Write an enzyme that holds these catalytic residues in place. Structure first.
Site, mmCIF file in Angstrom:
data_model
loop_
_atom_site.group_PDB
_atom_site.id
_atom_site.type_symbol
_atom_site.label_atom_id
_atom_site.label_comp_id
_atom_site.label_asym_id
_atom_site.label_seq_id
_atom_site.Cartn_x
_atom_site.Cartn_y
_atom_site.Cartn_z
ATOM 1 C CB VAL A 1 -0.968 0.022 1.196
ATOM 2 C CG1 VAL A 1 -1.710 1.360 1.260
ATOM 3 C CG2 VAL A 1 -1.951 -1.131 1.113
ATOM 4 C CB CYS A 2 4.220 1.736 1.448
ATOM 5 S SG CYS A 2 3.800 1.007 3.063
ATOM 6 N N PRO A 3 3.716 2.298 -1.547
ATOM 7 C CG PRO A 3 4.002 0.659 -3.164
ATOM 8 C CD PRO A 3 3.987 0.857 -1.683
#
Lengths: 197, 197, 197, 197, 197, 197, 197, 197, 197, 197
Positions: free
Chosen positions: G49-51
């Site tokens: 999810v981070c990117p």
């Protein structure tokens, strides 16, 4: 075992409203510098041993003032109760007119400071304290409730401490005025021991 | 009011080596269950007020024993010093033969338990205590060092407490055997107050 | 294990009343700056090993003063008990006239500061402490009660510490005046070890 | 008076590696229950007073064992340092063969438990301790570093304590085998005091 | 886990008596301001791994000194034990003459401060520490007792830290003088990586 | 000496997610019971000295595994960053394929338990630890950040400890496989010393 | 529940190394005095999810800057890992070029001060914070890990807090630019309520 | 991150009297086990942003119940004030009929347990919390008083967490029903990244 | 609000000696289970407002008993002072005969437990407490000393609490028997509000 | 039992937002210096007993102001709820227009400072407090919730305290304007007692 009254040390200070000659008046320890003080507690006004002690001390109050010593009674009862008891005939268990102050220790501060508060009843034991002119406690006497004290002995003790205060000697057992004292050192004391044995 | 010494409560127990009829023997408070005890401390052996008190109580010892009361003296001196003093003639400031035990409080526990240790010198003030047959402390008397106590007053107190114990009445101020006592309640006390006023 | 007597540190200060040549005098450690002091505690006056040690040191007192070292005896007994013991003949277990001071430790403060108090009995163990002119503790000797000390050994130690104080060499085992010493360094010390082995 | 070392109390237990007849071995205080024990601490191997005390005790070890007393030397040095010093000729400042165990107090726990650690250097003062067959500490001797102890005095003390243990008498000052003892009660002690005065 | 030795912080100060050229000399870290220091602890004198490490560093001492680095050995043994070991021939397990100081840590202060004290025995582990000229600790090496350290690795590390100090580059694994180094930033490091892979 | 890392004690336990042969898998100290472990911390992925150390150990992993020793690298970086680095070409500063696990200490628990965390930056110093097959820590090596470690010295140390584990002898300075060891007792150690000196 | 981020109060200060336009630069909260700040934490680089969050905020960065608001990302990964991720194509899970700073919270202090540290994993929850030009925290948003945040909502909130700062009115639920607002007092607020009901 | 409110942990328990369809009714967190809960605090009844948020949620209440999510509003106002407000028409700034419970946090326990109590005023910030059927907190949202929340974002988040709960995938930035999710592992996530870049 | 006296909780238990019909009797709160109690403190016997309050309550005593309510007065004065005051004619400021108990609180425990003790005087404020048949405190009234309480108000409050106790309705301001009550719920309360407005 | 409201001492200071004449205004105790204050707490707006006490006091507000006494109402409800209740007709349970201020104790600070908080519900008991013009608390009245207070008794008490304030005499039980007072000394009080008995 409780409180702050310690022999040889300054007696605990106290202030209290007292009944003096049918009137109310503040009474503090500082008022008695230079004078001896016999401070005696008692449990309850309108009781039984209590009036006999207060009366006995009042009648002979001048014997103590003749020596420079004021006598003070105190209990946890208020000044109004003291006054009421004073306005009660001695035939009725009252005090009648009184030649000694009667202090009110309603905060229990005096009884707690002198370690005589019978905590389970909130009343003071029959505690008697002898304070010298310098404010130093010299004698402690506490009786259980059912036995009253002796004004003869209280006078004898006041006389004794005043004598040793001025003349630097010590009072043997049973010393009353006029009895021999002892010079408190090994050599000078032989005078007394050879005379009385 | 003395260390662990609280009037109305059990007297502080004690066990000590004593001189008894010229010999060393253990003495305990438990030996006197059922008997009154007059326990008087004194500062030092071979001094001045001290011998007059010890002799006074020894001479009157049997007056106390007829009442079922035992007199015990105590100081921080050892039993060996006690015996040397007993073996000193009274003409020389000694005690001579004694009729009362002389307890040794070298550990200073007795003095501390009874709150009479003049800390800055390590010796006991002139603390006297009256214990009844049930082991309850009834009376505390403590003098500063320069003034002896009164044997007559100590005997009067023992008699008064033995009387209140037996008859459930209270003893007025200055009471002595034969004197009138009070019935301690509002209704029956009027008998006394009206008579004597 | 108790107290403040640490070797190589200043000796615990003390101040006491002592019987000096039949009279009472105050004795401070500061009174002995520049001089050595042998301070020896003993349990109780009018006992058994005690008189032999006090008399032994008293007799040899000048053997120590010749070396500029004062000898002081101390117990928890008072100065009045000390004097009474001095006035008892040695044939009866007394001390007789004394050439050293006898200090009173009635507060037990000295015995506690030197960690020699037998707490369960309140008396001092046979503690002996050697103090140099600068007030530094150099030796501790403490015997259980049944065995007396040796005045000879005390003197040998005073002599050895003053010698090493003066010459910076060190005294072998069993050293006595006139015996060889050791120069405390790896090279010079071999002078001694080659000779004595 | 030494850390956990208190006269009349059980000597602090210890366990340590020692050199015994040129070999390493565990040594414990409990190994000597039933025998007397002289335990002497010393600061450092390969120094100056140290070998003279160790040698002296070793030479006289059999004189103590005839009395049922084992001698033990201790220092903070290790057993390898002890052994190398034993393997150094006495002519060269060494110890040569030893007849006493030599314990290694590398943890300094023995020195800390016996209260002889000179903390600023981490080495032991010249502390000697006599322990009886029951494991109770009877004597404490501690010298500053410059002055060696006396093996004669340690032997005299072991003899005296063994005499008082068996017979129940007490040893006067300077007592040696063949000297008079005192019976420690007031009456029987008179035999001695009239004989020797 | 114990002590005060932390990489990147001032190395714990120390001061100790040391054997320097067969003589006793005080040695302290502040003596080495501006110079690198290799401080290596070893457990015990007169043992087995120990002499080989002490000899190996003494022989390479000048290799370190040419770089401005002083080598120091230390154990808990006294300086006298050090000196006696130096005077033992290497054929007999001794050290022989040495080119590096041998510090005596009898108080265990150095060992504690550097966290290398094997508590259950009171001896130092094989801890080696590298300290830069600013007094900051750069490297920690600690070996269990049965395995000796590597002098080659110590020299390599001193060289590496001095190179990185000056040039701001970082030394890859296994670096030695003459090997490529890395410029520690993302862009310039690609020079090393692209050449060496 | 590091957090909970104590020589001679059970190594601090650890449990981590690791990249192993390109995949994620849990690694824990109990996995290596019976095998030696070389646990080396490094500060940060994608830096400069770090890949050279990791690559050096990975290239020589089998040299350790032949000795029954497993090599493990660890940093505070996550397993996802470890894997991105493994997937980066070595020419570009990456690791490429690895032969050793790379542990992710994202909680900083391993670095804190092993006392290698550089608190002001939250990264591990270059700490290296050798743990034997019994879980006991044998060697600590911590470098400041600029200087990489030596895989040669780590292998030598593992070999030395394994040799001393099996044969009970001790490894001298610079010992390599084939060199002479010492029997660690006073008598048997002379074989080595006279031989090599 | 943890940390110091409290709405209506000065946002906790932060200071960190970041990746800005491909290079390393320091970033402090004081750099943004006078501007709004959207500070969003995320768990780990090279995850999932981070990117998508970092990229969404990067592509919409200018929409925030047109309003005087700077977006900042932060995680516990280092700036070297950040850059490596930036240098990884988006098609392979990377970030590609970024238009926002990426702060490195390697010490976990920022995450701790803002109370978003998932302690059991050592990473940051999806915490987003809106700080106003005066440095006061105005909004807190924290998601569990599996659910990303909304850039649209963050923009709406920045716009809304900037509208209320300027005009003193307040924004209703769902307010978007152009929607009506409420004058916050009893009487004037009726303009809104009558209109919309 | 709020008082006891921690993401990934059990939501702080609460019980409150609430208005439900015109009547009072106890409402507990345990009543909603197995269902999602959206719990939003608001400062004060009869104010300005407050009714727009409450009405917005009330109108959408069934959109949440269709998902198995129950919406609860709470403030410190009593249930009698809540009812009065519900009985106030919306044109007058009232709530009118309501399809959601309104909890009364008169003890301020809910606001304190959820860390949203604006202490200086005694009211709750605009704290919204999302709790899953397991009683676990998944999302925190807190606005300063002037800006209202978004019922659309709250629904998106509920849909997102419910989605990730069922399928084990994760929701990218700005995810809404119909959008792609990511398989949260390195290999499977490549599907998403190559598809969307 | 009174030491241990709290509305809605059990009233502080009490046990005391009281004057009841000219005799002494124990009084305890347990005696009044199933009956209301009006317990009114007053400062001092033989004072001024005090008797007027006691007499006013004594005259109305039966008015409270018809309602099942017992009235009790209490001060710190002793029961002996109470009786003396009772045996004093009212025209003299006395109480004369009484129809309510007069409790003695000379331990001040009742006053301290009910938090009415004026500490700087040791006397009780004019605190009145109403206790229901189940022993729960329903009402507290405390006046400064100069102003007396109202027996009418005390009766009104007893009537009020007994009415609400029985019918489960609430008593409006100024409620007296005959006045309407309110049904405490939103719907049924409208009957009252529409009638009286 | 809780709080700080003490008779005879300065009333707990307070400051609050209030509704005065239908508008919000700050009220603080300092605003009423020189005037008496009747401060009455009530639990909740929009309930049952509460409106009858507020309306009753509002109707009689001028009767108090003619005496120089202000009346303040206070509950934990906010000023927005106070105003809504005022804008509700009395026939419907509302307050209608008011002639006394209504304070909002949303922080519970006032209720806690005056010890009237019913903690389990977060609401204030029916506590009423009378403060003189000097700021001294003179009267405490607290009722359980189901019984309202009496505006008549509150007015009576104010008059009595203002009379005693001005004339120094004391008010008997039931005093209302015009009734005789007492001169508070033993002699002068007889005037009252003979007349009325």
């Amino acid at each position: 075992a409780s409180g702050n009254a310690r022999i040889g040390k300054p007696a605990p200070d106290f202030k209290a409203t007292a009944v003096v000659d049918g009137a109310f008046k503040e009474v503090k320890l500082s008022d008695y510098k230079g004078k001896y003080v016999v401070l005696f507690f008692y449990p309850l006004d309108f009781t039984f041993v209590c009036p006999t002690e207060i009366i006995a001390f009042s009648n002979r109050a001048e014997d103590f003032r003749k020596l420079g010593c004021e006598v003070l009674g105190v209990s946890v009862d208020s000044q109004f109760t003291h006054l009421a008891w004073i306005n009660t005939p001695r035939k009725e268990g009252g005090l009648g007119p009184l030649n000694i102050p009667l202090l009110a220790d309603v905060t229990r501060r005096l009884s707690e400071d002198y370690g005589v508060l019978k905590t389970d009843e909130g009343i003071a034991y029959r505690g008697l304290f002898i304070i010298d002119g310098k404010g130093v406690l010299r004698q402690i006497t506490v009786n259980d409730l059912p036995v009253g004290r002796s004004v003869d002995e209280a006078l004898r003790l006041v006389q004794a401490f005043q004598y040793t205060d001025e003349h630097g000697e010590v009072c043997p057992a049973g010393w009353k005025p006029g009895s021999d004292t002892i010079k408190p050192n090994v050599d000078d004391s032989k005078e007394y021991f050879s005379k009385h044995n």
